[PDB]
Amino acid sequence: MLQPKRTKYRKPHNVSYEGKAKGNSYVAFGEYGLVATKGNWIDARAIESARIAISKCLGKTGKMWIRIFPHMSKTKKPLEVRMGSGKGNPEFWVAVVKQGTVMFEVANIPESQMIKALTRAGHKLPVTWKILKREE
Amino acid sequence: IAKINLLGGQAKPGPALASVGINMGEFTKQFNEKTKDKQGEMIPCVITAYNDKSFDFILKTTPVSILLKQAAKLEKGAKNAKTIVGKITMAKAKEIAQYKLVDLNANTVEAALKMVLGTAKQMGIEVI
Amino acid sequence: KIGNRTITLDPAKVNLNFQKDHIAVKGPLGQIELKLPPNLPLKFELKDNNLQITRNNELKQSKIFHGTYNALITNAIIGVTQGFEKKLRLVGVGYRANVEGETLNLQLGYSHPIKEKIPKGLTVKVEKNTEITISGISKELVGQFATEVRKWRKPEPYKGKGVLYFDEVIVRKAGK
Amino acid sequence: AKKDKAQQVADVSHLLSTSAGFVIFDYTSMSAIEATSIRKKLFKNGSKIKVIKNNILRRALKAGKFEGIDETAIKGKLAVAVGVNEIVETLKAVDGVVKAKEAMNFVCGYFDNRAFNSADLEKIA
Amino acid sequence: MKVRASVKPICKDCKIIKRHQIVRVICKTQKHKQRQG
RNA sequence: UACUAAGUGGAAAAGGAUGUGAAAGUGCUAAAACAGCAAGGAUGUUGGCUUAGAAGCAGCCAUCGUUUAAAGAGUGCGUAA
RNA sequence: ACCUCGAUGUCGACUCAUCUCAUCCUCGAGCUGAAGCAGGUUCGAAGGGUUCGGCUGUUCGCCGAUUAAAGAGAUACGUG
Ligand SMILES: O=C(N[C@H](CO)[C@H](O)c1ccc([N+](=O)[O-])cc1)C(Cl)Cl
Ligand SMILES: [K+]
Ligand SMILES: [Mg+2]
Ligand SMILES: [Mg+2]
Ligand SMILES: [Mg+2]
Ligand SMILES: [Mg+2]
Ligand SMILES: [Mg+2]
Ligand SMILES: [Mg+2]
Ligand SMILES: [Mg+2]
Ligand SMILES: [Mg+2]
Ligand SMILES: [Mg+2]
Ligand SMILES: [Mg+2]
Ligand SMILES: [Mg+2]
Ligand SMILES: [Mg+2]
Ligand SMILES: [Mg+2]
Ligand SMILES: [Mg+2]
Ligand SMILES: [Mg+2]
Ligand SMILES: [Mg+2]
Ligand SMILES: [Mg+2]
Ligand SMILES: [Mg+2]
Ligand SMILES: [Zn+2]
């Protein structure tokens, strides 16, 4: 469960995911990457599910990079609570993924295994994923 | 056709042969008659199982890579290929090749030479 | 390709009358009739001992029709010259069949007696009680008879009991 | 590629030009153990059994200015059995082996700038 | 017969067909029959 | 002038599919292409630890080499093996 | 908090039921770690049926004895 050690403000305004791709747009650490095609809010739980799935289907020498990080938190008012009396308490942390940001990258294991590994990582995420390679 | 495992000094048993119709009791003498030159060593036999009943049999050499262990002066090879423990020269390799030329289907003797290297690589023994 | 495959036939006894929509094939055995659906996108040509089917366009159904009726003409010719046969291995503990007139009766495992009517043009013989041979001049009819005889006792996977086809292997299971 | 095929056709044509005897066989129902056994029983560098392409064999034959062998290499299974100097013992050896086999056909070959028939192969042993 | 929203071959012998404008998977092994692709 | 065969049009997602049309590249092919059919499809050996046992198809020590057109410590099934 | 505070009677029970299928029984079929009997799961199917009691206002619920079965809901949580 990825989580910032401390934050200055407990309850920040939500960060929009509509728009193009700001940073993390091109594979620059590995050479295959899982790009997104639909901006959405994805939480640290989905990262851990996808990262554990990919790691289980990885090998003994493969190496991985995690680009996105859940910096921003989100709140949720408790159930059966009527409107008013202030904002709710922070519940879960979500990373803002825009259309075009490379989320996961893999290297150092043959080609066939990485496509399968990226596939299982993207089936754990709500965004519509697509595979990209690193420019020579 | 059956490749059956029988000890050189003890080959009278074996029920599987009886299923094909082989005359087991008459043929026991033939099995034991031509293996006394290699007593104690385990020698499998190939049997031309068929209905002619004149079952021609051929003996067979003990499996390889046990003489590699004897020549390397070690009982069991390394459990990792990278760690090299045993060393074998060309003279010990060539004695095995001319010994094992009978069972091998190679035309030349250098082909049998590089069989020793081939099985030594599996054992991890350096070819010096 | 099936459409562009030769259909070399000897003129010894097999003739093929091509009407508008009524193909007639006559030979050693009975005559086989094939109906042509209207507006068929494929024209036959009748040279000496060679029939060639050609098409007018590159449509999907045009290609599909060109292949299917070449096979049908091949199948019709083969049945007229030498016929078709199917072999059924009826195997079991008390299973046996025999033929009386036009009805083939079986006693597989059923309290109610089993009778089966034989259609026209097909002859079924029973040399041995465990054996049935269906011989005919139309492939689909003998196939329909074979499968409709089978439907009474489909071969089960635990033992060999059933109306098996010949040289047909079934996956075995061990019901301890 | 084309250059390798050109090199291949040239060398086989040269080999059949400098040779003296040829016989064609089929590859129907004999084991690889048996195939290795035939190699050791010949043991002569003049005698050589080889799988050749049907197309490459005819094209090398055109370059060899020979004739009449075409009927052998048509709709058939083709072997090449080249013999240098003496070929009768090779033919005798292969004839003994096919008798030891289960089934075998045997197609006409070429020797001494002359061609033979199937029965002529029976007496060439 | 197995009804699934997604159908994919299980073993290399499984073959995809289109019957009655519905995609099914047929194979020698009857345990690998899928539908509703 | 093309496209659709779904009444789609005339409501929907993650996911799945030899539906079909267009385009841009690349491999082989009348020195014969692909599928299918007919043949072979190997030897040391069943390598060795290992496992009651595995030895073409348990985990391994790895992931051999020759003959040869081809052949794999095997493609599965399968055999206690 | 959009209709109704110049009035829309709100639980349960009784009577009468009707409709939907995400089917409890009956009907058909595929797979099974389906020998047979009895099962499990999925698919198709709404024509009919779907019990009586003890305690509690009770819906619910537990228990008793049967049944092929004692289905899930909607209809102003149907119906003064
Ligand atoms: O006033 C009545 N019913 C009102 C009409 O405005 C309304 O139907 C109503 C019914 C039930 C209710 N309740 O259960 O609290 C409240 C309002 C009746 Cl008491 Cl006459
Ligand atoms: K009111
Ligand atoms: Mg519509
Ligand atoms: Mg598709
Ligand atoms: Mg397309
Ligand atoms: Mg309010
Ligand atoms: Mg308001
Ligand atoms: Mg109102
Ligand atoms: Mg009023
Ligand atoms: Mg009133
Ligand atoms: Mg239903
Ligand atoms: Mg009715
Ligand atoms: Mg009382
Ligand atoms: Mg309600
Ligand atoms: Mg009410
Ligand atoms: Mg109610
Ligand atoms: Mg309520
Ligand atoms: Mg009323
Ligand atoms: Mg009332
Ligand atoms: Mg009243
Ligand atoms: Zn399958």
mmCIF file of N, CA, C and O in Angstrom, chain D residues 26-99:
data_model
loop_
_atom_site.group_PDB
_atom_site.id
_atom_site.type_symbol
_atom_site.label_atom_id
_atom_site.label_comp_id
_atom_site.label_asym_id
_atom_site.label_seq_id
_atom_site.Cartn_x
_atom_site.Cartn_y
_atom_site.Cartn_z
ATOM 1 N N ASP D 26 14.208 -44.877 -53.366
ATOM 2 C CA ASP D 26 13.130 -44.210 -52.655
ATOM 3 C C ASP D 26 13.385 -44.277 -51.153
ATOM 4 O O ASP D 26 14.249 -45.019 -50.676
ATOM 5 N N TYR D 27 12.615 -43.492 -50.405
ATOM 6 C CA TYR D 27 12.781 -43.341 -48.963
ATOM 7 C C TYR D 27 11.566 -43.861 -48.205
ATOM 8 O O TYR D 27 11.077 -43.230 -47.265
ATOM 9 N N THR D 28 11.061 -45.024 -48.610
ATOM 10 C CA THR D 28 9.841 -45.594 -48.049
ATOM 11 C C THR D 28 10.174 -46.683 -47.031
ATOM 12 O O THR D 28 10.700 -47.743 -47.392
ATOM 13 N N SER D 29 9.863 -46.414 -45.761
ATOM 14 C CA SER D 29 9.865 -47.394 -44.668
ATOM 15 C C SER D 29 11.235 -48.053 -44.469
ATOM 16 O O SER D 29 11.427 -49.248 -44.705
ATOM 17 N N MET D 30 12.193 -47.240 -44.026
ATOM 18 C CA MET D 30 13.380 -47.784 -43.379
ATOM 19 C C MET D 30 13.835 -46.812 -42.300
ATOM 20 O O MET D 30 13.762 -45.594 -42.478
ATOM 21 N N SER D 31 14.312 -47.364 -41.188
ATOM 22 C CA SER D 31 14.561 -46.588 -39.983
ATOM 23 C C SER D 31 15.867 -45.804 -40.087
ATOM 24 O O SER D 31 16.740 -46.095 -40.909
ATOM 25 N N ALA D 32 15.987 -44.789 -39.227
ATOM 26 C CA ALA D 32 17.225 -44.020 -39.153
ATOM 27 C C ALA D 32 18.363 -44.841 -38.563
ATOM 28 O O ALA D 32 19.520 -44.658 -38.957
ATOM 29 N N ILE D 33 18.065 -45.731 -37.611
ATOM 30 C CA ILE D 33 19.066 -46.701 -37.174
ATOM 31 C C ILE D 33 19.570 -47.496 -38.369
ATOM 32 O O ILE D 33 20.779 -47.707 -38.533
ATOM 33 N N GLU D 34 18.650 -47.946 -39.223
ATOM 34 C CA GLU D 34 19.038 -48.647 -40.440
ATOM 35 C C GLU D 34 19.814 -47.727 -41.375
ATOM 36 O O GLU D 34 20.768 -48.157 -42.035
ATOM 37 N N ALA D 35 19.419 -46.451 -41.440
ATOM 38 C CA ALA D 35 20.129 -45.493 -42.280
ATOM 39 C C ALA D 35 21.574 -45.322 -41.829
ATOM 40 O O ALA D 35 22.487 -45.260 -42.658
ATOM 41 N N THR D 36 21.803 -45.221 -40.520
ATOM 42 C CA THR D 36 23.175 -45.148 -40.031
ATOM 43 C C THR D 36 23.931 -46.447 -40.284
ATOM 44 O O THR D 36 25.132 -46.416 -40.567
ATOM 45 N N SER D 37 23.240 -47.588 -40.212
ATOM 46 C CA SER D 37 23.867 -48.876 -40.503
ATOM 47 C C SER D 37 24.357 -48.962 -41.944
ATOM 48 O O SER D 37 25.435 -49.508 -42.205
ATOM 49 N N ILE D 38 23.581 -48.436 -42.895
ATOM 50 C CA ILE D 38 24.017 -48.446 -44.290
ATOM 51 C C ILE D 38 25.275 -47.600 -44.466
ATOM 52 O O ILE D 38 26.191 -47.980 -45.202
ATOM 53 N N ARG D 39 25.357 -46.462 -43.774
ATOM 54 C CA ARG D 39 26.543 -45.617 -43.887
ATOM 55 C C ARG D 39 27.801 -46.357 -43.443
ATOM 56 O O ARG D 39 28.852 -46.249 -44.085
ATOM 57 N N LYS D 40 27.715 -47.114 -42.347
ATOM 58 C CA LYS D 40 28.889 -47.822 -41.845
ATOM 59 C C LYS D 40 29.248 -49.042 -42.687
ATOM 60 O O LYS D 40 30.433 -49.367 -42.817
ATOM 61 N N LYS D 41 28.258 -49.730 -43.263
ATOM 62 C CA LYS D 41 28.579 -50.923 -44.044
ATOM 63 C C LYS D 41 29.284 -50.564 -45.349
ATOM 64 O O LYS D 41 30.183 -51.291 -45.788
ATOM 65 N N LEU D 42 28.897 -49.457 -45.989
ATOM 66 C CA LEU D 42 29.631 -49.005 -47.171
ATOM 67 C C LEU D 42 31.051 -48.595 -46.797
ATOM 68 O O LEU D 42 32.027 -49.180 -47.281
ATOM 69 N N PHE D 43 31.184 -47.584 -45.939
ATOM 70 C CA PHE D 43 32.454 -47.146 -45.361
ATOM 71 C C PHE D 43 33.472 -46.711 -46.412
ATOM 72 O O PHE D 43 34.646 -46.507 -46.082
ATOM 73 N N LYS D 44 33.053 -46.560 -47.664
ATOM 74 C CA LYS D 44 33.935 -46.189 -48.762
ATOM 75 C C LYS D 44 33.597 -44.771 -49.204
ATOM 76 O O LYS D 44 32.421 -44.430 -49.360
ATOM 77 N N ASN D 45 34.631 -43.948 -49.395
ATOM 78 C CA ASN D 45 34.411 -42.563 -49.796
ATOM 79 C C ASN D 45 33.833 -42.463 -51.202
ATOM 80 O O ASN D 45 33.153 -41.481 -51.520
ATOM 81 N N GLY D 46 34.091 -43.455 -52.054
ATOM 82 C CA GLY D 46 33.488 -43.447 -53.376
ATOM 83 C C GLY D 46 31.983 -43.633 -53.328
ATOM 84 O O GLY D 46 31.248 -43.026 -54.111
ATOM 85 N N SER D 47 31.507 -44.467 -52.409
ATOM 86 C CA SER D 47 30.083 -44.722 -52.246
ATOM 87 C C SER D 47 29.481 -43.700 -51.289
ATOM 88 O O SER D 47 30.001 -43.490 -50.189
ATOM 89 N N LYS D 48 28.383 -43.074 -51.707
ATOM 90 C CA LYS D 48 27.748 -42.031 -50.906
ATOM 91 C C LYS D 48 26.249 -42.056 -51.159
ATOM 92 O O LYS D 48 25.812 -41.954 -52.309
ATOM 93 N N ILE D 49 25.471 -42.192 -50.088
ATOM 94 C CA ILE D 49 24.019 -42.066 -50.142
ATOM 95 C C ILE D 49 23.642 -40.664 -49.689
ATOM 96 O O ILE D 49 24.218 -40.132 -48.731
ATOM 97 N N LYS D 50 22.683 -40.056 -50.384
ATOM 98 C CA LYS D 50 22.309 -38.674 -50.120
ATOM 99 C C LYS D 50 20.857 -38.459 -50.521
ATOM 100 O O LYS D 50 20.382 -39.043 -51.497
ATOM 101 N N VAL D 51 20.162 -37.622 -49.758
ATOM 102 C CA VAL D 51 18.849 -37.115 -50.141
ATOM 103 C C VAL D 51 19.039 -35.857 -50.976
ATOM 104 O O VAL D 51 19.591 -34.860 -50.500
ATOM 105 N N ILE D 52 18.580 -35.906 -52.221
ATOM 106 C CA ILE D 52 18.658 -34.779 -53.139
ATOM 107 C C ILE D 52 17.246 -34.308 -53.461
ATOM 108 O O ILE D 52 16.280 -35.080 -53.401
ATOM 109 N N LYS D 53 17.125 -33.022 -53.779
ATOM 110 C CA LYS D 53 15.856 -32.495 -54.259
ATOM 111 C C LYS D 53 15.567 -33.017 -55.658
ATOM 112 O O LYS D 53 16.468 -33.141 -56.492
ATOM 113 N N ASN D 54 14.296 -33.342 -55.907
ATOM 114 C CA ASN D 54 13.902 -33.803 -57.233
ATOM 115 C C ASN D 54 14.165 -32.728 -58.281
ATOM 116 O O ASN D 54 14.695 -33.017 -59.361
ATOM 117 N N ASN D 55 13.799 -31.479 -57.979
ATOM 118 C CA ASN D 55 14.026 -30.384 -58.918
ATOM 119 C C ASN D 55 15.511 -30.156 -59.163
ATOM 120 O O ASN D 55 15.939 -29.982 -60.310
ATOM 121 N N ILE D 56 16.310 -30.153 -58.096
ATOM 122 C CA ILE D 56 17.733 -29.868 -58.239
ATOM 123 C C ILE D 56 18.427 -30.982 -59.013
ATOM 124 O O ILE D 56 19.377 -30.725 -59.764
ATOM 125 N N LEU D 57 17.980 -32.231 -58.845
ATOM 126 C CA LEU D 57 18.579 -33.334 -59.587
ATOM 127 C C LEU D 57 18.330 -33.214 -61.088
ATOM 128 O O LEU D 57 19.249 -33.432 -61.885
ATOM 129 N N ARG D 58 17.101 -32.883 -61.504
ATOM 130 C CA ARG D 58 16.862 -32.721 -62.937
ATOM 131 C C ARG D 58 17.663 -31.560 -63.513
ATOM 132 O O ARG D 58 18.249 -31.685 -64.593
ATOM 133 N N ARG D 59 17.725 -30.433 -62.798
ATOM 134 C CA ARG D 59 18.426 -29.268 -63.331
ATOM 135 C C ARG D 59 19.922 -29.528 -63.446
ATOM 136 O O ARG D 59 20.572 -29.042 -64.379
ATOM 137 N N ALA D 60 20.485 -30.289 -62.508
ATOM 138 C CA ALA D 60 21.885 -30.683 -62.621
ATOM 139 C C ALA D 60 22.084 -31.667 -63.766
ATOM 140 O O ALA D 60 23.152 -31.690 -64.388
ATOM 141 N N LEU D 61 21.067 -32.483 -64.051
ATOM 142 C CA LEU D 61 21.110 -33.392 -65.193
ATOM 143 C C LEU D 61 21.129 -32.643 -66.521
ATOM 144 O O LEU D 61 21.829 -33.054 -67.454
ATOM 145 N N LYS D 62 20.363 -31.553 -66.639
ATOM 146 C CA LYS D 62 20.450 -30.734 -67.847
ATOM 147 C C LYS D 62 21.863 -30.206 -68.057
ATOM 148 O O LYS D 62 22.364 -30.192 -69.188
ATOM 149 N N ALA D 63 22.524 -29.767 -66.985
ATOM 150 C CA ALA D 63 23.896 -29.299 -67.130
ATOM 151 C C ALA D 63 24.869 -30.438 -67.406
ATOM 152 O O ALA D 63 25.992 -30.179 -67.850
ATOM 153 N N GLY D 64 24.472 -31.682 -67.154
ATOM 154 C CA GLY D 64 25.324 -32.816 -67.437
ATOM 155 C C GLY D 64 25.190 -33.392 -68.830
ATOM 156 O O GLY D 64 25.803 -34.425 -69.117
ATOM 157 N N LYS D 65 24.438 -32.732 -69.714
ATOM 158 C CA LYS D 65 24.225 -33.158 -71.095
ATOM 159 C C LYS D 65 23.914 -34.651 -71.226
ATOM 160 O O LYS D 65 24.267 -35.280 -72.230
ATOM 161 N N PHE D 66 23.266 -35.242 -70.226
ATOM 162 C CA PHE D 66 22.777 -36.606 -70.352
ATOM 163 C C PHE D 66 21.305 -36.607 -70.755
ATOM 164 O O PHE D 66 20.632 -35.574 -70.751
ATOM 165 N N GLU D 67 20.803 -37.794 -71.099
ATOM 166 C CA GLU D 67 19.427 -37.928 -71.559
ATOM 167 C C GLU D 67 18.858 -39.280 -71.148
ATOM 168 O O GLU D 67 19.592 -40.224 -70.844
ATOM 169 N N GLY D 68 17.525 -39.352 -71.145
ATOM 170 C CA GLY D 68 16.784 -40.559 -70.843
ATOM 171 C C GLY D 68 16.487 -40.809 -69.379
ATOM 172 O O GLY D 68 15.634 -41.654 -69.076
ATOM 173 N N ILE D 69 17.155 -40.109 -68.460
ATOM 174 C CA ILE D 69 16.909 -40.306 -67.031
ATOM 175 C C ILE D 69 15.640 -39.602 -66.570
ATOM 176 O O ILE D 69 15.170 -39.850 -65.451
ATOM 177 N N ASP D 70 15.044 -38.765 -67.427
ATOM 178 C CA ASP D 70 13.891 -37.957 -67.031
ATOM 179 C C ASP D 70 12.735 -38.815 -66.529
ATOM 180 O O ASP D 70 12.028 -38.426 -65.591
ATOM 181 N N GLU D 71 12.517 -39.979 -67.146
ATOM 182 C CA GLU D 71 11.423 -40.849 -66.723
ATOM 183 C C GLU D 71 11.591 -41.312 -65.281
ATOM 184 O O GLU D 71 10.596 -41.539 -64.584
ATOM 185 N N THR D 72 12.834 -41.463 -64.820
ATOM 186 C CA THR D 72 13.072 -41.833 -63.428
ATOM 187 C C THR D 72 12.629 -40.729 -62.472
ATOM 188 O O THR D 72 11.966 -40.998 -61.465
ATOM 189 N N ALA D 73 12.985 -39.482 -62.769
ATOM 190 C CA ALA D 73 12.668 -38.363 -61.883
ATOM 191 C C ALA D 73 11.400 -37.652 -62.357
ATOM 192 O O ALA D 73 11.414 -36.511 -62.815
ATOM 193 N N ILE D 74 10.283 -38.365 -62.225
ATOM 194 C CA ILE D 74 8.959 -37.811 -62.486
ATOM 195 C C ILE D 74 7.982 -38.481 -61.531
ATOM 196 O O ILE D 74 7.834 -39.710 -61.558
ATOM 197 N N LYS D 75 7.312 -37.693 -60.680
ATOM 198 C CA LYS D 75 6.262 -38.226 -59.805
ATOM 199 C C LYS D 75 6.783 -39.423 -59.012
ATOM 200 O O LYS D 75 6.114 -40.449 -58.870
ATOM 201 N N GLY D 76 7.998 -39.278 -58.488
ATOM 202 C CA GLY D 76 8.677 -40.356 -57.796
ATOM 203 C C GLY D 76 9.508 -39.876 -56.625
ATOM 204 O O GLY D 76 9.779 -38.682 -56.466
ATOM 205 N N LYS D 77 9.859 -40.836 -55.771
ATOM 206 C CA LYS D 77 10.725 -40.612 -54.623
ATOM 207 C C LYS D 77 12.166 -40.822 -55.071
ATOM 208 O O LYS D 77 12.495 -41.885 -55.607
ATOM 209 N N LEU D 78 13.028 -39.826 -54.860
ATOM 210 C CA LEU D 78 14.340 -39.835 -55.495
ATOM 211 C C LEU D 78 15.417 -39.881 -54.420
ATOM 212 O O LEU D 78 15.391 -39.084 -53.475
ATOM 213 N N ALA D 79 16.357 -40.810 -54.568
ATOM 214 C CA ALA D 79 17.637 -40.831 -53.876
ATOM 215 C C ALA D 79 18.773 -40.665 -54.875
ATOM 216 O O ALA D 79 18.594 -40.843 -56.082
ATOM 217 N N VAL D 80 19.951 -40.315 -54.368
ATOM 218 C CA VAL D 80 21.163 -40.316 -55.177
ATOM 219 C C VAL D 80 22.166 -41.223 -54.474
ATOM 220 O O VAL D 80 22.365 -41.120 -53.257
ATOM 221 N N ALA D 81 22.758 -42.144 -55.233
ATOM 222 C CA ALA D 81 23.761 -43.086 -54.734
ATOM 223 C C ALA D 81 24.983 -43.029 -55.642
ATOM 224 O O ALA D 81 25.079 -43.797 -56.604
ATOM 225 N N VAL D 82 25.910 -42.136 -55.349
ATOM 226 C CA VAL D 82 27.063 -41.947 -56.218
ATOM 227 C C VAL D 82 28.163 -42.925 -55.833
ATOM 228 O O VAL D 82 28.437 -43.158 -54.649
ATOM 229 N N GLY D 83 28.766 -43.523 -56.845
ATOM 230 C CA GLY D 83 29.867 -44.449 -56.641
ATOM 231 C C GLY D 83 31.032 -44.037 -57.512
ATOM 232 O O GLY D 83 30.857 -43.701 -58.682
ATOM 233 N N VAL D 84 32.226 -44.067 -56.932
ATOM 234 C CA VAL D 84 33.434 -43.728 -57.670
ATOM 235 C C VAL D 84 34.234 -45.003 -57.892
ATOM 236 O O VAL D 84 34.226 -45.920 -57.061
ATOM 237 N N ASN D 85 34.921 -45.060 -59.035
ATOM 238 C CA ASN D 85 35.629 -46.253 -59.491
ATOM 239 C C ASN D 85 34.685 -47.442 -59.629
ATOM 240 O O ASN D 85 33.935 -47.548 -60.605
ATOM 241 N N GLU D 86 34.725 -48.338 -58.647
ATOM 242 C CA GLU D 86 33.938 -49.564 -58.654
ATOM 243 C C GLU D 86 32.567 -49.309 -58.029
ATOM 244 O O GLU D 86 32.472 -48.803 -56.907
ATOM 245 N N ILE D 87 31.511 -49.658 -58.764
ATOM 246 C CA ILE D 87 30.136 -49.503 -58.293
ATOM 247 C C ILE D 87 29.391 -50.824 -58.123
ATOM 248 O O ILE D 87 28.341 -50.841 -57.463
ATOM 249 N N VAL D 88 29.905 -51.940 -58.645
ATOM 250 C CA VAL D 88 29.178 -53.205 -58.543
ATOM 251 C C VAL D 88 29.048 -53.658 -57.091
ATOM 252 O O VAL D 88 27.993 -54.158 -56.685
ATOM 253 N N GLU D 89 30.101 -53.499 -56.283
ATOM 254 C CA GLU D 89 29.991 -53.936 -54.893
ATOM 255 C C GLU D 89 29.011 -53.058 -54.121
ATOM 256 O O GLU D 89 28.307 -53.546 -53.229
ATOM 257 N N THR D 90 28.956 -51.761 -54.439
ATOM 258 C CA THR D 90 27.953 -50.907 -53.809
ATOM 259 C C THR D 90 26.549 -51.356 -54.187
ATOM 260 O O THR D 90 25.661 -51.429 -53.330
ATOM 261 N N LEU D 91 26.327 -51.662 -55.468
ATOM 262 C CA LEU D 91 25.016 -52.148 -55.889
ATOM 263 C C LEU D 91 24.710 -53.501 -55.261
ATOM 264 O O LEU D 91 23.567 -53.771 -54.877
ATOM 265 N N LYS D 92 25.717 -54.372 -55.170
ATOM 266 C CA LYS D 92 25.535 -55.650 -54.490
ATOM 267 C C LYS D 92 25.175 -55.445 -53.024
ATOM 268 O O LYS D 92 24.290 -56.126 -52.491
ATOM 269 N N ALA D 93 25.858 -54.514 -52.356
ATOM 270 C CA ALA D 93 25.597 -54.261 -50.943
ATOM 271 C C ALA D 93 24.187 -53.726 -50.723
ATOM 272 O O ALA D 93 23.465 -54.194 -49.837
ATOM 273 N N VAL D 94 23.777 -52.736 -51.520
ATOM 274 C CA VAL D 94 22.444 -52.166 -51.351
ATOM 275 C C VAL D 94 21.371 -53.184 -51.719
ATOM 276 O O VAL D 94 20.282 -53.181 -51.136
ATOM 277 N N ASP D 95 21.656 -54.073 -52.677
ATOM 278 C CA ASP D 95 20.692 -55.106 -53.043
ATOM 279 C C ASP D 95 20.492 -56.109 -51.913
ATOM 280 O O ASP D 95 19.365 -56.555 -51.664
ATOM 281 N N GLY D 96 21.571 -56.512 -51.246
ATOM 282 C CA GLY D 96 21.424 -57.379 -50.088
ATOM 283 C C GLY D 96 20.603 -56.745 -48.978
ATOM 284 O O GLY D 96 19.821 -57.421 -48.306
ATOM 285 N N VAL D 97 20.771 -55.438 -48.775
ATOM 286 C CA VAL D 97 20.064 -54.742 -47.704
ATOM 287 C C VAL D 97 18.570 -54.628 -47.998
ATOM 288 O O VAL D 97 17.737 -54.839 -47.109
ATOM 289 N N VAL D 98 18.202 -54.288 -49.236
ATOM 290 C CA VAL D 98 16.781 -54.165 -49.557
ATOM 291 C C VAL D 98 16.079 -55.508 -49.426
ATOM 292 O O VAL D 98 14.899 -55.570 -49.061
ATOM 293 N N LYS D 99 16.785 -56.599 -49.729
ATOM 294 C CA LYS D 99 16.246 -57.928 -49.462
ATOM 295 C C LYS D 99 16.042 -58.149 -47.969
ATOM 296 O O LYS D 99 15.086 -58.817 -47.557
#
